[PDB]
Amino acid sequence: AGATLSRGPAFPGMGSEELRLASFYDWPLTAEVPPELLAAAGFFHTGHQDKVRCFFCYGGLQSWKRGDDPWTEHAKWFPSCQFLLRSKGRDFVHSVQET
Ligand SMILES: [Zn+2]
């Protein structure tokens, strides 16, 4: 039994946090979450509003709000993302999924 998750990042170039940060150069004024937290959690900015995607799983999120936790949102929506699991561990993800 079992297909395996592919090991290739959706967008390998955006694999660098520093590079991910650059993408937030036009992260909007009305946006409510800081790019540092976003880039750290693997997201980079696309489009001109508040859409982001994870460089690894390509999970796409928008409508960011004051207090929203990027790492948490990550585990909420894309539990199997290998970047999320290497960075935060099995327990953290399981913890967010179970609530
Ligand atoms: Zn991801």
UniProtKB/Swiss-Prot annotation:
<comment type="subunit">
    <text>Binds to CASP9. Interaction with DIABLO/SMAC via the BIR domain disrupts binding to CASP9 and apoptotic suppressor activity. Interacts with TAB1. In vitro, interacts with CASP3 and CASP7 via its BIR domain.</text>
</comment>
<feature type="binding site">
    <location>
        <position position="74"/>
    </location>
    <ligand>
        <name>Zn(2+)</name>
    </ligand>
</feature>
<feature type="binding site">
    <location>
        <position position="81"/>
    </location>
    <ligand>
        <name>Zn(2+)</name>
    </ligand>
</feature>
<comment type="similarity">
    <text>Belongs to the IAP family.</text>
</comment>
<feature type="binding site">
    <location>
        <position position="54"/>
    </location>
    <ligand>
        <name>Zn(2+)</name>
    </ligand>
</feature>
<feature type="repeat" description="BIR">
    <location>
        <begin position="20"/>
        <end position="85"/>
    </location>
</feature>
<feature type="binding site">
    <location>
        <position position="57"/>
    </location>
    <ligand>
        <name>Zn(2+)</name>
    </ligand>
</feature>
<protein>
    <recommendedName>
        <fullName>Baculoviral IAP repeat-containing protein 7</fullName>
    </recommendedName>
</protein>
<comment type="function">
    <text>Apoptotic regulator capable of exerting proapoptotic and anti-apoptotic activities and plays crucial roles in apoptosis, cell proliferation, and cell cycle control. Its anti-apoptotic activity is mediated through the inhibition of CASP3, CASP7 and CASP9, as well as by its E3 ubiquitin-protein ligase activity. As it is a weak caspase inhibitor, its anti-apoptotic activity is thought to be due to its ability to ubiquitinate DIABLO/SMAC targeting it for degradation thereby promoting cell survival.</text>
</comment>
